[PDB]
Symmetry: C3
Subunit: 169 residues, 3 copies
């Protein structure tokens, strides 16, 4: 009963080494902390703002690595290339509106610019996928908004099956 | 101008008689109460957690029975088989985000585990479909969150048409 | 860096001249006010509650007129013909859940009948589309709920591309 987590950084800037990935490095620090989630980093990667490459990575981590949780950081704003939510929508099987709601209310409680965030939260197989903002402060804060329900959420999904495996079987 | 309501219990446990359907029996008691909705139970059924059987029942109650309201209870959590929201999404014509929002905020106001609920609310023909949690306390509480707008909501849908009937006509 | 706005009134009543379009005329007054958004009205039109005519108008204003913002007023309730949200869903490329959430919470803060509103907010090319209620008071109030994030939202979309133009190019 260990928690295998994947952190996926979506950003043309970090991908082209124009900037340091402080958000993703910090999330990896937050996910492994015993006082928080106490999980283990089982995957990490920086991809550009391309829906097809985000979708492929997500499917791989869910169907092949069978991670329990994937936190994506970046690509959830209004800027033209921000398509993380759209890629997430094409890969999830079941939507988790309550988690997206939790993070959005928390944000709008902080600033009206909170309505410029477009996160999607969903489930695929035994994996929960959470769209976090690209900034270090925001992804850390949003992660805290949902952290209380993550342990129970993950445990509920532990015995789910990877569809492509059932359909073939 | 009577309110014909259907209560649909989705749960492998109750379907296999492993447990008593306290939530669905209680909702039928809440829906018929004159101080609450004062409706009439026009349909009731216990089905398993199978998206196809939920979808078929829903379509039948809307297109053939033309119920004014359908309250489903169960199958809206994170457990692998909980697919009530997904079945509901495949049958509704128009979504009612405000009602799902109302119930979710009410839940998160009670507990952070409220973000583990994934209800969908929508409209098909003259029928409003509400996804309620499987527990007796939760489905009763969520029902109360929306009850104030149900009378007006139902009246607005009374003169809607059953599409399969217009398309054939 | 000017803000070219379109106001689209959806309503069989106004279309058949059965009623004055106070909501749309007033929104045009709110959008052009220097103390508010200070934009310019670049398009305006009254259409009936027909999903196909709403979709066509929306696509035209986004792909051909390349407006920065479109505020639709009307057709977001439970009445059988209210299909503005459905037409909006068929034309947006990216959804903006936070804005719809902002307006809904603001409404439910005013009245429980706020859960009878079904607005959708989304992005297509460099255009943001906001579904506002048909009443003058509501569309004015909802507009105020989101106004704080509109300037930043619009600026972020200024350099987006009109897909049909890239795909052909």
């Amino acid at each position: 009963h260990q928690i295998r987590v994947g952190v996926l950084t979506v950003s043309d800037s970090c991908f082209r080494n124009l900037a340091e990935d402080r958000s993703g490095i910090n999330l990896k620090d937050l996910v492994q902390d015993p006082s928080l989630l106490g999980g283990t980093i089982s995957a990490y990667k920086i991809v550009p703002d391309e829906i097809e490459e985000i979708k492929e990575t997500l499917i791989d981590w869910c169907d092949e690595k069978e991670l329990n949780l994937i936190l994506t950081t970046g690509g959830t704003g209004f800027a033209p290339r921000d398509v993380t939510p759209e890629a997430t929508k094409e890969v999830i099987e079941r939507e988790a509106p309550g988690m997206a709601l939790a993070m959005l209310m928390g944000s709008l409680n902080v600033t009206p610019l909170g309505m410029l965030s477009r996160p999607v939260c969903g489930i695929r197989g035994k994996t929960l996928i959470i769209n976090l903002p690209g900034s270090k402060k925001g992804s850390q804060e949003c992660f805290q908004f949902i952290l209380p329900a993550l342990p129970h959420a993950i445990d509920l999904l532990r015995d789910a099956i990877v569809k492509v495996k059932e359909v073939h079987d």
